[PDB]
Write a protein that binds this ligand. Structure first.
Ligand SMILES: OC[C@H]1O[C@H](O[C@H]2O[C@H](CO)[C@@H](O)[C@H](O)[C@H]2O)[C@H](O)[C@@H](O)[C@@H]1O
Lengths: 142, 142
């Protein structure tokens, strides 16, 4: 399926929810948010991905941790927009659905911004992760 | 069928390529390019739409004109994304296909920017036009 460009840096390890996304539509957005977004974990059908970020509790040496944010999506709700501020890492993530405008994960939004529109709805994410979110890519449904 | 949101302003006159697009998959992109994109004209199979933009040579009394640019797509190449800068009008357009990022039409990219994913590839465009491209909507195969 069509995918955005990769937004972020070379750090961390690669992840790709392509296979996980066979479990279903995105039904839930889980992130950890402070001045930056430190992990993301989407639910496909009833199955969470692994926690893409905040690799271990000693990561607190290099950024704050943040609070766990959960946005449950209703059936027929899908993500149609992502605003990402990024540089070497993802800084902040603001999702919108076809029903809702979700709050930004990451209070700082000073890094360069990109708005990615996903008509028909996001299918899954890939990117790179470690103590935080090194980068994100958005994959459409076709 | 899935279509992006309308990007641009309320000016000019509506156009829609749904009917012409029954002549085939998009085979080439024609545009006119200065600091801004002043028209767009796609070819559906062997059949071009009308010129959507630069309505009159007297439009030069308001904006620059630009030079004609043609991008021929190879068989099986499809348009997967468009970086659009826009406000009152479309300002610049950078198309990408499943095989390549193409040159931007419009050297000025200073207005609000948006990266539109086009799931399954672009099927046709709609929007509004006059002396310039007042707005665009991207109709995807999915
Ligand atoms: O505490 C372990 C390491 O954490 C940081 O580095 C990791 O996290 C970064 C952000 O996700 C990645 O870019 C990087 O590749 C990971 O190794 C910290 O910078 C390191 O000093 C720590 O060893």
């Amino acid at each position: 399926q069509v995918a955005s460009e990769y937004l972020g840096g070379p750090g961390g390890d690669a992840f790709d929810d392509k296979a996980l996304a066979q479990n279903g539509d995105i039904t839930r957005i889980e992130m950890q948010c402070t001045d930056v977004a430190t992990y993301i974990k989407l639910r496909y059908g009833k199955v969470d991905s692994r926690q893409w970020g905040w690799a271990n509790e000693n990561c607190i040496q290099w950024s704050k941790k943040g609070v766990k944010v959960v946005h449950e999506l209703s059936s027929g709700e899908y993500i149609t927009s992502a605003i990402v501020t990024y540089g070497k890492y993802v800084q902040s993530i603001t999702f919108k659905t076809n029903k809702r405008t979700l709050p930004r994960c990451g209070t700082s939004a000073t890094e360069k911004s990109v708005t990615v529109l996903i008509p028909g709805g996001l299918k899954y994410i890939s990117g790179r992760w470690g103590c935080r979110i090194d980068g994100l890519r958005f994959h459409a449904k076709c």
